[PDB]
């Protein structure tokens, strides 16, 4: 078996205590770490998957196990692609992590249960978000199908079909698969091979890195001096890294808390890399890699720096405080249990603007008809245009309004 790492990212969406983690487990082999010291930093889940060919009726394709025995052929599998999974929870309070996950993702999998409530706005909202964030590769999957009646499922499918056609996602495949009884995943695997292609990626463009998770390597058992460096789980979109480069977290931090601040952002060199199971040399983008840099084990532990941009020495981007946004509004609101109508923008009110992955608070000053000027409270960086989703407040918690683009 060759040690070729991740190439393309696939994600999973749903609801709490429904069936996403179970699905992930079914897909993979080794159990995940996520769900204070271990794993606890962000609500996002990271898991891997295998694409192995064995082609030497119509539906049979490949087996997840390293050695296939169930169909018949005892031959050795062809290496085509290795993939990394990002698990994102659809809880009503926390969605920043989900948003962050979306930015790195290039394939989306929808999972809704069968033996519960049918019309849910959250799923629709998720779909809308997917449509917005540069995606056409949408696969619909049904979770709990085994505890369902003979025609009810069919009816549900029909209803779904009726619902979904007038969207950005054109020819979306719909597959019903069980996660608790372990069946029918072959079809899914086949689909994964068929529908999803690989976009071009080269060494030319300057590196862009996003760190979601943070880890510390301190476990009880050994004596006093048995220490390892701080590991930062960072996923790459474009820009290849080799061992021997300086990694920096962009926004910066306060040095004394009186006294003026002028200290540059935190620089760190790579000590030990963690990919799939163990160590590797080259970092091919399109996967979440636990990069172990010279950042403190005391710093990376809790909710302090979740979802921030990472650059390299040599190339310099720009940091902004006043942001410029062009907005597009929707007809009626998404993600509300009954539906409510969208009001026009009002001056002097706290609203949350999500640019790419960051969750930041913004205040409205001057809006004519298309352009919007906003004031930031927590630091944020700007590169090109980014995938922007707006969130406004009416009652209790956050609600989506529409999509946005930066004009410069």
């Amino acid at each position: 078996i060759i040690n070729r790492q991740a190439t393309i990212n696939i994600g999973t969406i749903g609801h709490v205590a429904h069936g996403k983690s179970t699905v992930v487990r079914a897909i993979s082999g080794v159990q995940t770490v996520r769900f204070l010291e271990r794993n606890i930093t962000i609500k996002l889940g990271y898991a891997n998957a295998k694409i192995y060919k064995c082609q030497e009726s119509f539906k049979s394709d490949k087996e997840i196990s390293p050695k296939c025995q169930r169909p018949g052929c005892p031959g050795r599998y062809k290496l085509v692609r290795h993939v990394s999974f990002v698990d994102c929870p659809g809880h009503d309070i926390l969605m920043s992590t989900m948003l962050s996950g979306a930015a790195v993702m290039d394939a989306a999998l929808l999972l809704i249960a069968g033996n519960e409530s049918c019309p849910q706005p959250q799923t629709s909202e998720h779909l809308a978000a997917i449509e917005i964030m540069k995606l056409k590769h949408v696969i619909i999957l049904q979770n709990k199908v085994d505890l369902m009646r003979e025609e009810s499922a069919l009816e549900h499918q029909k209803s779904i079909l009726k619902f979904i056609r007038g969207t950005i996602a054109d020819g979306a495949p719909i597959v019903p698969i069980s996660a608790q009884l372990k069946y029918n995943i072959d079809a899914v695997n086949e689909f994964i091979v068929k529908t999803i292609p690989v976009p071009p990626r080269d060494f030319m463009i300057s590196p862009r890195l996003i760190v979601i998770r943070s880890f510390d390597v301190n476990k009880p058992g050994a004596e006093i001096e048995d220490l390892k460096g701080g590991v930062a789980g960072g996923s790459i979109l474009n820009g290849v890294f080799k061992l021997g480069d300086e990694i920096e977290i962009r926004p910066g931090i306060v040095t004394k808390d009186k006294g003026k601040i002028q200290c540059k952002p935190i620089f760190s060199n790579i000590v030990s890399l963690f990919a799939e199971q163990n160590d590797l040399k080259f970092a091919v983008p399109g996967g979440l890699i636990g990069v172990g840099t010279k950042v403190d084990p005391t710093l990376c532990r809790a909710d302090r720096l979740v979802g921030q941009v990472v650059g390299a020495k040599g190339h310099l981007p720009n940091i902004y405080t006043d942001i410029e946004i062009n907005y597009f509004l929707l007809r009626r609101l998404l993600g509300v249990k009954k539906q409510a109508k969208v009001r026009k923008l009002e001056p002097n009110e706290v609203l949350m603007v999500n640019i790419g992955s960051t969750a930041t608070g913004a205040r409205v000053v001057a809006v004519k008809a298309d352009m919007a000027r906003l004031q930031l409270t927590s630091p944020a960086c700007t590169e090109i245009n980014e995938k922007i989703a707006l969130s406004r407040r009416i009652e209790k918690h956050w609600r989506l309004i529409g999509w946005a683009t930066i004009k410069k």
Partner: protein
């Protein structure tokens, strides 16, 4: 089994002091067992016991200081007196008794260990210590400070002796919180640790470092810990990091 005399000989002399533990009173006086000179009974008549409600007390547990009058060194008969003992050397006598008790206590591990008669063990112990030196507790103390009495006798059980020695033979905690922001960190932490060690140091989770400092003579503790804290403070401020001490 508990037997064997405290001194070298079985039967007491004239004018010597003994401590008695009372079992029963009335009719005769107190024909009771001794805790200074063998477990065999020694008697006082109802006259020498008191001087100055007399019958109200003296039952079980209470100790009496008495001087030996008449000894029959043939079969086993002891006579005692309480009135003659003056309150000038009584404290000394008490001290002696205490010492004897301590010695007896010391001779128990051996009895426990090799499952052999206690009297023989006592005899083997008493030949270097109780014979030449005088009193045994002081000799024991001397031995524990500077080995001087154990030279005269060969040990059938050295392990037991070692155990005894061990038997004959204060941890203070400190809190340090680390939360850096500068370039280098792990190395700095290591350096800090190296300035607060010298015995037992352990790691718990992530932000807290727990060290236990051993005290020589009770009061000592602040005279190193504070210095260590100061050193730590000196360490972390230069680069661009903050640490807190509660």
């Amino acid at each position: 089994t508990s037997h064997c005399r405290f001194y070298e000989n079985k039967y007491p002399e004239i004018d010597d002091i003994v401590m008695v533990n009372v079992q029963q009173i009335a009719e005769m006086g107190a024909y009771v067992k001794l805790l200074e000179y063998d477990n065999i009974e020694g008697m006082i008549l109802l006259s020498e016991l008191s001087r100055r409600s007399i019958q109200k007390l003296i039952r079980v547990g209470k100790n009496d200081v008495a001087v030996v009058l008449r000894v029959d060194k043939e079969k086993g008969y002891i006579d005692l007196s309480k009135r003659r003992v003056s309150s000038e050397d009584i404290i000394k006598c008490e001290e002696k008794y205490q010492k004897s008790k301590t010695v007896h206590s010391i001779l128990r591990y051996c009895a426990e260990k090799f499952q052999i008669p206690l009297e023989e063990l006592y005899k083997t112990i008493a030949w270097p210590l109780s014979r030449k030196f005088g009193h045994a507790y002081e000799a024991f103390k001397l031995s524990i400070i500077d080995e001087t009495v154990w030279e005269g006798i060969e040990p059938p059980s050295k392990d037991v002796l070692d155990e005894l020695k061990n038997y004959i033979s204060v941890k203070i905690r400190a809190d340090v919180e680390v939360s850096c922001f500068s370039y280098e960190g792990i190395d700095a932490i290591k350096d800090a640790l190296k300035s607060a060690e010298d015995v037992k140091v352990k790691l718990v989770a992530a932000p807290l470092y727990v060290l236990t400092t051993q005290a020589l003579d009770k009061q000592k503790g602040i005279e190193q810990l504070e210095s260590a804290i100061e050193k730590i403070t000196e360490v972390i401020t230069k680069y661009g990091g903050v640490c807190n001490i509660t």
